[PDB]
RNA sequence: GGGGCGGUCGCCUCCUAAAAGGUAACGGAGGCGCCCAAAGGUUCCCUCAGAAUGGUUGGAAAUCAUUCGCAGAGUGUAAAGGCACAAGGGAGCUUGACUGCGAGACCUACAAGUCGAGCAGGGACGAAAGUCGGGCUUAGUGAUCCGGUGGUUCCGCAUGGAAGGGCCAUCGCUCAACGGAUAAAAGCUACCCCGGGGAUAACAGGCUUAUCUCCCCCAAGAGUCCACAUCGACGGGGAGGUUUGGCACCUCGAUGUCGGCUCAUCGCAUCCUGGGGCUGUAGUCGGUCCCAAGGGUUGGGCUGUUCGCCCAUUAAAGCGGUACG
RNA sequence: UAAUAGCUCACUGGUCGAGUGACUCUGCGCCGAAAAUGUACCGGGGCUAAACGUAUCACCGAAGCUGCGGACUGUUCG
RNA sequence: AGUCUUGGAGGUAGAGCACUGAUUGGACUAGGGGCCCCUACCGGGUUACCGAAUUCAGUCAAACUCCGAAUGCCAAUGACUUAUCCUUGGGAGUCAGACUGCGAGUGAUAAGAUCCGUAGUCGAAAGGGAAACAGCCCAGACCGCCAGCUAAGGUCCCAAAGU
RNA sequence: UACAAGUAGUCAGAGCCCGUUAACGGGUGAUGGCGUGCCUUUUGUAGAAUGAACCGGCGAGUUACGAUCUCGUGCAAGGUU
RNA sequence: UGGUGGCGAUAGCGAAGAGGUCACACCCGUUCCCAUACCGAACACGGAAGUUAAGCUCUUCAGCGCCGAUGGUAGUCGGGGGUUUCCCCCUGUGAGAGUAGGACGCCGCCAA
C-alpha cells in the first residue's frame, strides 16, 4: 500500500535520467525520507534507479 | 602470400573484435586441427610461414587444410610524414581471427606427428593456441 | 625536416536533407500536414493521404494517423477521421 | 596537425553515422554547372536480361521460331530509395512544360528551400470516372545595385505634354575564393619597423616507440656426419628511451644553438685487467656465454666539424646519461 | 680403431615387496626482467600475514545527513 | 517533466548467404597445355598438368542484407508523482575547452594526439579518499557548537579505528 | 629563541608577564595538526608564464543631443509647446 | 457450378487423378462494326460443327517454396569488477539460420 523511501547514495555524478527520476519523487537531499503510495509507476521508478535509493515497507 | 585477386575497395575501417568466432569453430575436414583462444590479426607472412613449416616437415604424409583468407587489407602512411591529409596507401593483407576459430587442419597423418608439427607451426603465429581434434 | 602529401580529393558531400516521419501513430493531424518525407515510395499512401510530387505523404482530411502493414512486406499510411 | 609549396572553396548521392532527425576531420567512394518538342500530359495495349536448341550470307554475338526465366534488364545521367497492379516498352491525340491562388505542414538563426489538398478562368485527354500547375524522386545553379527590352486602367515639380521614375513580365555575372568588399589589382625585404602569441614553428624538456640499439622465442639449414662449438632463414615476442621522428603540454614581457677547452660525475648492455662454463679448447693464441663498475681506458695527419679514414703505439685505445653535461 | 673388450640400453626370469604413470581443467606462484645525482615500482616503518580468496560482525571515517542555536530569501499567511 | 500501459517509424549490435563482391575443399566435366601418328591435328589416345560452368560442404564484408534486438526517439490513453513549460518585452557573456567511461573515425585500434556522439567532473566546486594531484572514487560548504550516524577508504606504528 | 629547515599563518596548547570600552580578558608563546602569497591570462597557475622594491597622493564607463524600454507622475481621445 | 471482393503464398510451384447436358473454355468463318508499324492466334465481329485435350473446377501428397514459440545461447539497457584494443558477475531484456510442427486455402454477396 504505502511504501516509504530513502535516498542513500548522493545523486552527484549520476546521469540526468537518474537525476530527474529521483527528483520527481521529491528527493530534495540525501537521506531525506519520503512516503509514497504503491503502484506500477512507483515500482517502475524504484526498479529503474535501484542503487541511489533504498525502499522498505512501513 | 594469399592475395585476394580483386577487392571492391582498397581501404576500409580497421574494425573491432568481440566475442567468439562466427563459424568454423571446430575441425571439419581434417583429423586434427589447431585453434586460437584470443582475438588478433593474421597476415600473409604468418599464414605462409606456418603453411611451409607444416608441409615441408610433413612431406608426403598427407594434406593440410587452411581456413583463413586475408580479404581485409590494412593501410600504413609512408614513413617519416606528419599524420593526416589522406589515408595512407595499402601495403598488406590481413585476416581477422576471433577466438574459437580453428586455423589449420591435417588429414591422412598419424596423431603424434601432427601434434608436434602443429606445435612447431604455432610458434610462427603470434597467438596462444590449443590443440583440438574432431569428435 | 618534412615531406609532402596531398590529393585526398574526397572532402565533399551534399548538405544532407531531412527524411523521417513527423506525425506519430495516433497523433491528431490537420489537412495538408506532412506525414513522411521519404525519398522514393518507401511506404505507399492509404486512404485520405496523398502522394506529393517529391514522393511525400500528406493528409487530405484532418483526423488521426495510423500506420499498418501492406501485403507481405510493404507498409502504408492512412488517416482515419475521428 | 607552424608557415611556404601542394590540394580545396558552391551544389547533388552513399558510408563513416552509435536501428528517429542531426552530427566533424587535408576521412572513404562518385557526380553536377545539363539534356529532352519529346525522353513532357493524357487514353489505350504489353513485359524483361541471359541461357539451350534448330536456322545460311552469319561467327561468340546481326535478323528469326520454341522453351526456361521475380527481375539478373531497364529506368536520359552519379549513388541511393522505389518501380513489372508499372515509374519499364509501344501507338493515337495533345501542349497543364497553364493564369490567379492556396487551408495547412516540413525545413529553418536570417536569407531562402520543399510539399500541399482545395477554389475560380480557360483548356488537353478520354464515353465516363477521372488525370494533367514539366521528367520516376533527389543535383544541372547565385543576392542586391545598375542598365537593357515588352505591357501598364500609376506618378509625372504653375497647367498640358513630355523627359524621368514606379508596378508587372524578363535579359546581362566560371561575382566557381560560388552569402557574392571595388566597375577597376601582382611580387621582394637577410635595410626592415610596430601590436600580440608559447592560441603557433626552430633547440632543449615532456608523451608515444613507428624507426633505432639491444635482448630473446620456434627451428629449416650451414656447420665433413651433428639444428643449438659458431652462425641462423622464414615467422613471433619483448626491454631502453642515446638517432630519425608523430603530438603541441610548459617556456616567444626571451630557457643561448654545433665542436673544442676546463672540470667532472653516474649506468653496465664490459675495451683491458680479476674469477668461471662450453668449445670444432693439444700447448702460445682464440670464439661464445656467466659473475664483475674497483681502477684504467693514448699521442698525431686531414677536416669548423663531432663522426670518420690514416700514421705510431698501448693491456685496452668501451658504449651511453647528466638541457645531444 | 671396423664386430674381436668388465660394458650398456629391446626383451623376459629371480630379490625384497606398496602405491605408480600418462593426460585434461583450474587457483596461486617462479625464470624470461639491463639505465643513468640516492634506497627509488607498498607513502615510509616494517609485514610470512600487517598478502590473497571467501564469509560474518564491530569500529573509524566529510564542510554528506541528523542533533541544538542563529541570519536571510521564498510558498502557504505569528 | 518522470514513470506504468498501448501503438508507431527507424535497419545498428547480432546473425546470415536470399542478392553484390571476396573466398576454401570434394565431385564433375566444357575448354585449354599433352606428345604420337596419320597430318591443314579430321578425329583418336593422351598424364589432374591446368581448367571455365554446375552441384555438396565451408568461411567473410562501412559503403551485401531473406532477418533483426536491447536502448534511444515520436505520440495516444488514462494512473501516481512532480511543478516546470510557452508568448511578448529589457540586459548580457559565451564562439581557445580539458579529462575520464562507452561507440566510432585519422593514426601503427601509439600518444596527456586530433575529430565526433553519448554520460559525468572540472571549467564555475571547497570537503574526505587515491602519498603529493581539476578533471579517478565518495560528496555539495548560509553561519556557530569541545554533538551523533554514515559514504569512498581503512583499523600493526607513523595515523582514528579489529595484532 | 643556538638539534632545527617550513607562503610564516591559523586551530589546539603548557609556562611566564600584564590587568580591559569587564569579558566565557590582553601580550608572548615551548610543542602538535593543517596549510604552495596576491593579480592577470588561461581548459589548466604554488607555479620555473606576466606585474608590483616599499609608503603616500593622483589615476579609468561621464556629459550633450536624439532613440527606445521599465518605473513615477498631470491629463486624458487628447496631450503639448 | 459461374460472376465479383477481403485476407501476409498457412493461398505459391510441382507431381499424380477426376468433370462438362447446364456454366466456362477451346472451336467455326470474317459479311459488315474494329485490327493486325505483316495476320481474324489478338483485338472485335456473329454462331454452336465437336472436345474435356488445355484452361477452369474438384480428390491426394511435405519434393521445392511458405509460416512457425517454447529452454538455449550471441547481443544488450542499468549496476559492479578485472591482469582493460578486450573479458567477467548480478536485475531484466531478448538474436536467427534448428528442430516441435501448420499448411498443397479461409471468409463473403448476385446467378444455379
- Which stretch of DSSP H or E encloses residue A3? strand A2-7
Q: What angle do CA C12, C16, C19 make, to 5 degrees?
A: 155
Q: Do C3 and B85 touch (CB under 8 A)?
A: no
Q: Which residues of B touch C1 (CB under 8 A)?
A: 80
- Which stretch of DSSP H or E encloses residue C65? strand C63-70
For residues A35 and A28, the answer to whether their CB atoms sit within 8 Å is no
Q: Does C82 touch chain B (CB under 8 A)?
A: no
A36 burial level (CB within 10 Å; 0-12, 13-18, 19+) = middle
DSSP B48-84: HHHHHHHHHHHGGG-EEEE-----EEEE-PPSS--S-
Q: Do B86 and C7 touch (CB under 8 A)?
A: yes
Question: What is the nearest nucleotide to A33, using C1' and CA?
Answer: E65
User: How far apart (Å, rounded) are the C-alpha atoms in residues B34 and B115?
Assistant: 9
User: How far apart (Å, rounded) are the C-alpha atoms in residues C43 and C77?
Assistant: 7
CB-to-strand D under 7 Å, chain C 11-40: 11-22, 30-34, 37-40
- Cα separation of the two ends of chain A: 9
Closest of C60, C67, C66, C68 to residue C33, by C-alpha: C60
Provide the 10 A C-beta neighbour count for residue B106: 27
DSSP B12-28: -------SS-SS--S-S
Q: Which three cell numbers stand for residue A14?
A: 549520476
Q: Which of B78, B80, B85 sits opposite C6 (nearest CB)?
A: B85
Closest of C56, C61, C25 to residue C43, by C-alpha: C56
**H helices, E strands: number in chain B:** 2, 7
Q: Which three cell numbers stand for residue C48?
A: 485520405
Q: Do B86 and C3 touch (CB under 8 A)?
A: no
Count CB pairs under 8 A between chains B and C.
16
Q: Do B81 and C3 touch (CB under 8 A)?
A: yes
Q: Residue with C-alpha cell 493531424?
A: C29
Length of chain B: 135
User: How far apart (Å, rounded) are the C-alpha atoms in residues A32 and A52?
Assistant: 12
User: How far apart (Å, rounded) are the C-alpha atoms in residues B46 and B126?
Assistant: 8
B9 burial level (CB within 10 Å; 0-12, 13-18, 19+) = exposed
Which residues are CB-contacts of B113 (< 8 A; sequence separation ≥ 6)? B58, B61
Q: Does C72 touch chain B (CB under 8 A)?
A: no
**What is the resolution of the experimental data for this entry, in Å?**
3.4
For residues B36 and B101, the answer to whether their CB atoms sit within 8 Å is yes
Q: Which three cell numbers stand for residue B92?
A: 598488406
Experimental technique behind these coordinates: cryo-EM
Closest of B135, B133, B131, B125 to residue B107, by C-alpha: B133
Amino acid at each position: 500500500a504505502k511504501l516509504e523511501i530513502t535516498l542513500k547514495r548522493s545523486v552527484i555524478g549520476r546521469p540526468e535520467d537518474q537525476r530527474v527520476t529521483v527528483r520527481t519523487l521529491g528527493l530534495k537531499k540525501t537521506n531525506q525520507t519520503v512516503v509514497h503510495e504503491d503502484n506500477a509507476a512507483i515500482r517502475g521508478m524504484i526498479n529503474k534507479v535501484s542503487h541511489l535509493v533504498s525502499v522498505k515497507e512501513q | 602470400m594469399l592475395l585476394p585477386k580483386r577487392v571492391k575497395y582498397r581501404r576500409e575501417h580497421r574494425g573491432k573484435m568481440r566475442g567468439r568466432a562466427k563459424g568454423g569453430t571446430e575441425v571439419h575436414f581434417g583429423e586434427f586441427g589447431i585453434q586460437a583462444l584470443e582475438a588478433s590479426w593474421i597476415t600473409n607472412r604468418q599464414i605462409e610461414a606456418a603453411r611451409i613449416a607444416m608441409t615441408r616437415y610433413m612431406k608426403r604424409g598427407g594434406k593440410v587444410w587452411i581456413k583463413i583468407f586475408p580479404s581485409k587489407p590494412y593501410t600504413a602512411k609512408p614513413l617519416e610524414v606528419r599524420m593526416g591529409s589522406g589515408k595512407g596507401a595499402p601495403e598488406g593483407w590481413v585476416a581477422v581471427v576471433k577466438p574459437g576459430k580453428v586455423l589449420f587442419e591435417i588429414s591422412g597423418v598419424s596423431e603424434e606427428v601432427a601434434r608436434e608439427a602443429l606445435r612447431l607451426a604455432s610458434h610462427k603465429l603470434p597467438i596462444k593456441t590449443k590443440f583440438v581434434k574432431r569428435e | 625536416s618534412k615531406k609532402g602529401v596531398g590529393s585526398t580529393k574526397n572532402g565533399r558531400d551534399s548538405e544532407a536533407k531531412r527524411l523521417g516521419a513527423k506525425r506519430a501513430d495516433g497523433q491528431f493531424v490537420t489537412g495538408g500536414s506532412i506525414l513522411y518525407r521519404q525519398r522514393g515510395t518507401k511506404i505507399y499512401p492509404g486512404e485520405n493521404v496523398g502522394r506529393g510530387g517529391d514522393d511525400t505523404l500528406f493528409a487530405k482530411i484532418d483526423g488521426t494517423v495510423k500506420f499498418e502493414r501492406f501485403g507481405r512486406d510493404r507498409k502504408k499510411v492512412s488517416v482515419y477521421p475521428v
